[PDB]
Design an enzyme around this catalytic site. Sequence first.
Site, PDB file in Angstrom:
ATOM      1  N   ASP A 181      10.137  10.928 -17.262  1.00  0.00           N
ATOM      2  CA  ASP A 181      10.611  10.364 -16.621  1.00  0.00           C
ATOM      3  C   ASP A 181      10.006  10.023 -15.016  1.00  0.00           C
ATOM      4  OD1 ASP A 181      13.248  10.404 -18.168  1.00  0.00           O
ATOM      5  OD2 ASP A 181      14.496  11.243 -16.961  1.00  0.00           O
ATOM      6  N   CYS A 215       8.385  -2.208 -21.859  1.00  0.00           N
ATOM      7  CA  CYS A 215       8.846  -0.932 -21.105  1.00  0.00           C
ATOM      8  C   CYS A 215      10.043  -1.407 -20.327  1.00  0.00           C
ATOM      9  CB  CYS A 215       7.834  -0.266 -20.121  1.00  0.00           C
ATOM     10  SG  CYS A 215       7.034  -1.345 -18.938  1.00  0.00           S
ATOM     11  N   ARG A 221       3.893   0.852 -17.345  1.00  0.00           N
ATOM     12  CA  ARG A 221       3.329   1.688 -18.589  1.00  0.00           C
ATOM     13  C   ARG A 221       2.950   0.306 -19.446  1.00  0.00           C
ATOM     14  NH1 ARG A 221       9.035   5.139 -19.811  1.00  0.00           N
ATOM     15  NH2 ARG A 221       8.924   5.957 -17.596  1.00  0.00           N
ATOM     16  N   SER A 222       3.500  -0.824 -19.869  1.00  0.00           N
ATOM     17  CA  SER A 222       2.997  -2.033 -20.474  1.00  0.00           C
ATOM     18  C   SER A 222       1.730  -2.457 -19.999  1.00  0.00           C
ATOM     19  CB  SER A 222       4.149  -3.219 -20.461  1.00  0.00           C
ATOM     20  OG  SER A 222       5.393  -2.970 -21.024  1.00  0.00           O
ATOM     21  N   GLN A 262       1.723  -0.265 -11.710  1.00  0.00           N
ATOM     22  CA  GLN A 262       2.737  -0.286 -10.607  1.00  0.00           C
ATOM     23  C   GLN A 262       2.774   0.751  -9.487  1.00  0.00           C
ATOM     24  OE1 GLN A 262       6.372  -0.490 -13.036  1.00  0.00           O
ATOM     25  NE2 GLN A 262       7.436  -1.343 -11.577  1.00  0.00           N
TER      26      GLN A 262
END
Length: 284
Positions: A181, A215, A221-222, A262
């Site tokens: 998370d 994601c 993440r992508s 990110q």
Amino acid sequence: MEMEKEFEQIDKSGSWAAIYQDIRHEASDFPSRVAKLPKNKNRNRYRDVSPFDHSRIKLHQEDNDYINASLIKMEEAQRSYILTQGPLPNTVGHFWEMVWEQKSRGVVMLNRVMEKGSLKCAQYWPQKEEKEMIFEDTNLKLTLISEDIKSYYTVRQLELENLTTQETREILHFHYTTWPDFGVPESPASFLNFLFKVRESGSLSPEHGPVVVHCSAGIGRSGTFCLADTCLLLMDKRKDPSSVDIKKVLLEMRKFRMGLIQTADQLRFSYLAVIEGAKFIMGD
Ligand SMILES: O=C1NC[C@H]2CCN(C(=O)c3ccccc3)CC[C@H]12
């Protein structure tokens, strides 16, 4: 400069935040006018994450062709990816329309439906064989065929039917279920195992339409998934594997979708994944 030495130099100097901001500063800025039309407000999950007009995927319908999705086309690596947001309650039918129209064989999901106690994407696939899903707005039917649950990921076989023509296709769903998370994984071993499972399926190969990767926003993440895959393929193809520059590959990919990677921690994790993965590519 061998990236493994570049890596230790940045780590010892603790300059990850500085490298990352340099990428943010040099990244492309192209118009996203279609994403910002008032008719499309409920088709975007995040007000600050939009596809560029020049690279956006168009839906094959006259009504409204808009979806929050981008074509990333990597010319030297000979790989293409579609990066998209997690589907919203009113875009699950659009999502499956895109998979159908683009002739994709594989969907890669890097998030859980619920994280941090909030919903990060719609439950957009069926959980039981005998309870299929029908998307009345796009005329598609989706059936769960089989499910294989492993410690770090789940693979699902799905049947997508175009109700208009009664053509049927088998779509593979690759679900990475253990991204934490907060932060990034401590080791890239399970993420690289997952990447190699998607490759082994055929889903990334040129005989099929581009893989669909998502994601929650489809950039963090992508971004890590496509960046690692393309960097490892370039290290296989080139005479000098040490010439692959991960920062230059990331800036090339940012020509096609904003914001890929990110955080400075996602940038460091991408370097670690490529460095550890190369110890297979180079003959081990
Ligand atoms: O183009 C496609 N996209 C989704 C695919 C749906 C189902 N298909 C297969 O499982 C398959 C069989 C033999 C060889 C390679 C693939 C056929 C090809 C379809």
